[PDB]
């Protein structure tokens, strides 16, 4: 259901990190590290993407 602008817990933005992440996966095969480099330190902002379930993808396969 798309990524959440700003993390609930602390507030830090997290909109941009999406495409970046899904790439550092496909190729560079990371998790922990990718994130670390994406500047996502403390678990609070962290859990947002790693727990995000992009439903929108299946929805987009729908007509209107």
């Amino acid at each position: 259901m798309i990524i959440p602008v700003r993390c609930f817990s602390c507030g830090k933005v997290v909109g941009d990190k999406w495409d970046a992440y899904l790439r550092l996966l496909e190729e560079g095969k990371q998790e922990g590290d990718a994130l670390d480099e994406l500047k996502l330190k403390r678990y609070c902002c962290r859990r947002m993407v790693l727990t995000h379930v992009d439903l929108i993808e299946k929805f987009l396969r729908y007509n209107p």
């Binding site: 959440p4 700003r6 609930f8 678990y43 962290r46 727990t51 379930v53 299946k58 929805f59 729908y62």
Partner: protein, 1079 residues
């Protein structure tokens, strides 16, 4: 290894899928069954043959007959049923049978990925449901004590009867009579002891003796031949003595068949070929066998009546069946078809010398499935309600559960028996009322379908099986007797080889893996069950094929190999289906590994024939999502097992195209930080049921007290736990055979006035609103009228409001205007909404603070939620605390956290991994009180935990009334907040007040704040007659002719009626304003 058996499990669902049973049992009715049913007791004083079942159609006026499809019938509220035709012999349309989505006759069954996506059907939808008049109807499994089996019950000290044995009989294929045989045993275990049995149509009961002579065996010792298989068992024999004397008065077959009141004797025969033990077969030349049965019964009886065998376990699940969908459509059908039988008989009884309105088979079926009343319709409610409900759609795991649900008609049944192991989930079951009478099936469990008897009957009588007919109990001492589906098809000598050959024949797959074979050595018997309705689970085979020591048949080659379905995994003898009955005589090993020094932290762990695929498979949907249920107080798990069925999330993806009443979608979902390997098969990652809240179990403002939790406003603003709420009002344009149609407009004036209160200005000229419109108060959502111009327009419920999200007009079969409206609304969490984790830790919001006010940790990190430590000690739910820890690691470590049941992970282990990352080994962190900045003298259990936002938000409950809409019959207020109703002041509330002595106040409730009414009694005949014309003063009260002595009183109108009723029952309640009886 352990991680391997998982792949095995993976292999299973890839091919069978969570709802095998449902479809499989449906197809079995369509494909085969339905035919066999119509061809049995057909022919009428003209035969019937094969039947044709075409596909879905829609015969609507203003069009030909449009080939209808599921996703449409839903929206237009129709019926996913197709035609049925049959070439009758002395072509014809006969009823519409509702297909089951995702089955075989449903076109979806073939279409592939892209193909389906084009049919608008959501791939994740496993289907398995029916679509009657819109709403998705799911048939619910109905449990029932199996038939054709030997039992024995002891009957209490106060009763002329001691013990009794019963046996329910019914033809496994053909009509299925429901007449049971009762072989009682009067005279308690003392008194000076007859034996009587009950037969269908016989007034009194008959003494076993006569029954033998009445069969064709009149002399003794040829009788004990059948009963006792050991001339040296004097005990048993003794008991019988007094009994022989009873029947000593009838010395032959004539009188035998007589005494049952030439005409009756002839009739007697009848009652032996159609009433006496009607299952087995009703042929003719088989008299002999049953005699051996009736002997084996009275035997089984005494074996208990002599304290050698306990009383039969009434709730031994193995002796219970489950009538799934397929079976139900039978016993229901017969009742119908039999009325259909005698219906076509009526048309012929009018012909003083086509007609068959094939809607009675259509509408009849509908009635049941719609309501839940099986047995026909008519003035016949004498059916069972519960069957078929309104499939849940609150959350995905909710819907799932519902299909996998079983019922059980009514202190002992409710118990959780042993037999329930493996087959049913122990936790998931409704609270209060019926609790334990509603069971859900485990993951691995499955129900039988119906294999064939003969290919094993033959296979027997062609391997050592000397027929029952000629038996000699003393000549044949240890002859191992074999039973087939509750019938005795002769005995067999040494079975050991005969046994482990059929079972190996099955493993290759030439005699269905579904049949059950149980050998009870401890009695020398062989139980054979082919039956349809037997619950079964799968197990690993061990076999000692090691000529070099003492080991599991399966290897790492079968594994990596996973034209290779699950059917082959069975066709290779690697797994067997063990039902509850067969279980009794086997020995199952738990952990495959171990069961073939230690750390003082981990949990203490305590010939093998079978192994458990994996213990975490005995759970059903509910418990399956709970992390570490083996760390919480079991009764708590049982709670979450229900609350789960009430949380918010996303229940399907097509949701944006569904016009269903009520539906909620959680703004932003979130897959849990900790999971079960089993979740991988519950597509949960693609359909989460909640979010991961940054919990912090501590005390603060004191608003997190008594199971109430504090929620960080700041993140509530950031969209945390917000949810959409849908609703769908629908209307039609009704007509009459007498050309008088309704209208869908924007009515005003026009001689009638009959209109609503709200505003219509927000109605475009099409009589509808727009999707932009901001509706509120009561505003009319649809505009309708009835010319007889009275408004019948629908107004948004006074308590609701939101925004329109999509309106749509459409035709109906009766060429009427079908129109549904859907309203959307975003629901924000509020200081009252209910929430909960997956550990029965339910709670609502007490207040909401922001970032500042909130407590925080040096790192910066701040909590989203703060629940109270007091909700832990007596709740005992510890896994919660653990789920937190684990999830606090996977967060920091980025790796997905496995929470699955009995693995090799401990709190001490996890604690070390968390120490490797930087934070406290137990989770705990320092926090500074958001108001002063000063540290907290204590430390807090700060850590991310998953939280589901269950529905039941305040604004759906909040209700207040002061003199509103009054009921009609009573004239008191009305029920429900939806109709602006009023709260009941029931007994218990009365009582209390009376204790307080609040005399007046109570008098003021019941009168001023409800009923009340001024009635005029008569001073003579204390009645409510008086014709009080409040103007011309005229009072009167004929029959007692008075107009002078009349009194006025203030009583609750509710009571006045009570009296009128009493009057109307001829009783006379005289009311006197003066005492007359004196003393």
């Amino acid at each position: 290894t352990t991680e391997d058996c998982w792949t095995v499990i993976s292999a299973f669902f890839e091919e069978k899928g969570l709802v095998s049973q449902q479809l499989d049992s449906f197809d079995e009715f369509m494909e085969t069954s339905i035919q066999d049913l119509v061809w049995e007791e057909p022919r009428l004083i003209i035969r019937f043959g094969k039947i044709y079942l075409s596909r879905p159609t829609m015969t609507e006026a203003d069009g030909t007959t449009h080939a209808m499809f599921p996703q449409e019938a839903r929206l237009r509220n129709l019926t996913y049923s197709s035609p049925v035709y049959l070439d009758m012999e002395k072509k014809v349309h006969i009823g519409k049978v509702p297909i089951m989505l995702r089955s075989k006759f449903c076109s979806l069954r073939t279409l592939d990925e892209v193909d389906l996506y084009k049919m608008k059907e959501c791939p994740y939808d496993m289907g398995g449901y029916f679509v009657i008049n819109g709403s998705e109807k799911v048939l619910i499994a109905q449990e029932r004590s199996a038939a054709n089996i030997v039992q024995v019950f002891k009957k209490a000290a106060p009763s002329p009867i001691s013990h009794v044995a019963e046996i329910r009989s019914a033809l496994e294929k053909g009509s299925r009579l429901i007449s049971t045989m009762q072989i009682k045993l009067y005279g308690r275990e003392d008194k000076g002891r007859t034996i009587k049995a009950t037969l269908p149509y016989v007034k009194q009961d008959i003494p076993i003796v006569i029954v033998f002579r009445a069969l064709g065996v009149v002399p003794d010792g040829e009788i004990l031949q059948h009963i006792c298989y050991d001339e040296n068992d004097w005990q048993m024999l003794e008991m019988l003595k007094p009994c022989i004397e009873e029947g000593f008065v009838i010395q032959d077959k004539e009188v035998a068949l007589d005494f049952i009141g030439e005409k009756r004797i002839q009739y007697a025969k009848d009652i032996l070929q159609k009433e006496l033990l009607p299952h087995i077969t009703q042929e003719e030349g088989f008299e002999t066998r049953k005699t051996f049965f009736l002997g084996y019964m009275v035997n089984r009886l005494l074996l208990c009546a002599l304290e050698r065998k306990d009383q039969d376990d009434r709730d031994h699940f193995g002796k219970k069946r489950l009538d799934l969908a397929g079976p139900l459509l039978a016993n229901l059908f017969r009742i119908l078809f039999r009325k259909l039988t005698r219906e076509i008989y009526r048309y012929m009884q009018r012909c003083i010398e086509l007609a068959v309105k094939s809607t009675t088979i259509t509408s009849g079926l509908k009635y049941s499935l719609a309501t839940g009343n099986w047995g026909e319709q008519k003035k016949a409610m004498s059916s069972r309600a519960g069957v078929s409900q309104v499939l849940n759609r609150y959350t995905y795991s909710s819907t799932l559960s519902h299909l996998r649900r079983t019922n059980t008609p009514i202190a002992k049944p409710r118990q959780l028996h042993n037999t329930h192991w493996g087959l049913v989930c122990p936790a998931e079951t409704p609270e209060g009322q019926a609790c334990g009478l509603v069971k859900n099936l485990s993951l691995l469990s499955g129900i039988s379908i119906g294999s064939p008897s003969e290919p094993i009957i033959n296979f027997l009588e062609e391997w050592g099986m000397e027929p029952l007919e000629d038996y000699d109990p003393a000549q044949h001492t240890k002859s191992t007797r074999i039973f087939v589906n509750g019938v005795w098809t002769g005995i067999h000598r040494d079975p050991s080889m005969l046994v482990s050959t059929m079972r190996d024949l099955r493993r290759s797959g030439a005699i269905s893996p579904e049949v059950s074979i149980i050998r009870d050595i401890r009695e020398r018997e062989f139980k054979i069950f082919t039956d349809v309705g037997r619950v079964y689970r799968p197990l690993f085979i061990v076999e000692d094929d090691e000529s070099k020591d003492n080991e599991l048949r399966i290897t790492k080659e079968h594994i990596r190999k996973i034209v290779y379905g699950w059917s082959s995994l069975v066709t290779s003898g690697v797994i067997e289906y063990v039902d509850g009955e067969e279980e009794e005589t086997i020995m199952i090993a738990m952990t495959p590994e171990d069961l073939q020094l230690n750390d003082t932290a981990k949990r203490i762990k305590p010939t093998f024939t079978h192994c458990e695929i994996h213990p975490s498979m005995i759970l059903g949907v509910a418990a399956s999502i709970i992390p570490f249920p083996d760390h919480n107080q079991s009764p708590r798990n049982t709670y979450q097992s229900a609350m789960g069925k009430q949380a918010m999330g996303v229940f399907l993806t097509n949701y944006n195209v569904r016009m269903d009443t009520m539906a909620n979608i959680l703004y932003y979902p979130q897959k849990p930080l900790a999971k079960t390997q089993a979740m991988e098969y519950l597509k949960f990652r693609e359909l989460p049921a909640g979010q991961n809240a940054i919990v912090a179990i501590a005390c603060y403002s004191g608003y997190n007290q008594e199971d109430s939790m504090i929620m960080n406003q700041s993140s509530i603003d950031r969209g945390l736990f917000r949810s959409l709420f849908f609703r769908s009002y629908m209307d039609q344009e009704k007509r009459f055979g007498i050309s008088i149609v309704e209208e869908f407009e924007k009515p005003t004036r026009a001689t009638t006035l009959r209109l609503k209160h709200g505003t219509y200005e927000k109605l475009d000229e099409d009589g509808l609103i727009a999707p932009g419109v901001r509706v509120s108060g009561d505003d009319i959502i649809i505009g309708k009228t009835t010319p007889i111009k009275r408004d019948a327009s629908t107004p948004l419920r006074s308590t609701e409001n939101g925004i329109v999200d999509q309106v749509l007009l459409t035709t109906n079969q009766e060429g009427l205007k079908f129109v549904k409206v859907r309203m959307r609304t975003t629901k924000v969490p509020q200081i009252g909404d209910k929430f909960a984790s997956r550990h029965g830790q339910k709670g609502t919001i007490g207040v909401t603070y922001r970032h500042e006010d909130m407590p925080f940790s040096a790192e910066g990190i701040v909590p989203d939620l703060i629940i109270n430590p007091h909700a832990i000690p007596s709740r005992m739910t510890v896994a919660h605390l653990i789920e937190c820890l684990l999830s606090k690691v996977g967060s920091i470590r980025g790796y997905e956290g496995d929470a699955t049941p009995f693995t090799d992970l401990t709190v001490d282990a996890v604690s070390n991994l968390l120490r490797d990352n930087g934070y406290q080994s137990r989770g705990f962190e320092v926090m500074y009180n958001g108001h002063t900045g000063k540290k907290l003298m204590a430390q807090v259990f700060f850590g991310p935990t998953y939280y589901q936002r269950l529905r039941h938000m305040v604004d759906d409950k909040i209700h207040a009334r002061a003199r509103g809409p009054v009921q009609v019959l009573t004239r008191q207020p009305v029920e429900g907040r939806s109709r602006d109703g009023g709260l009941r002041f029931g007994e218990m509330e009365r009582d209390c007040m009376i204790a307080h002595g609040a005399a007046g106040f109570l008098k003021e409730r019941l009168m001023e704040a409800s009923d009340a009414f001024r009635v005029h009694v008569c001073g003579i005949c204390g009645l409510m007659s008086v014709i009080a014309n409040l103007k011309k003063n005229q009072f009167e009260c004929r029959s007692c002719k008075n107009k002078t002595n009349i009194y006025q009183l203030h009583i609750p109108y509710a009571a006045k009626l009570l009296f009128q009723e009493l009057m109307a029952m001829n009783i006379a309640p005289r009311l006197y304003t003066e005492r007359s009886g004196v003393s």
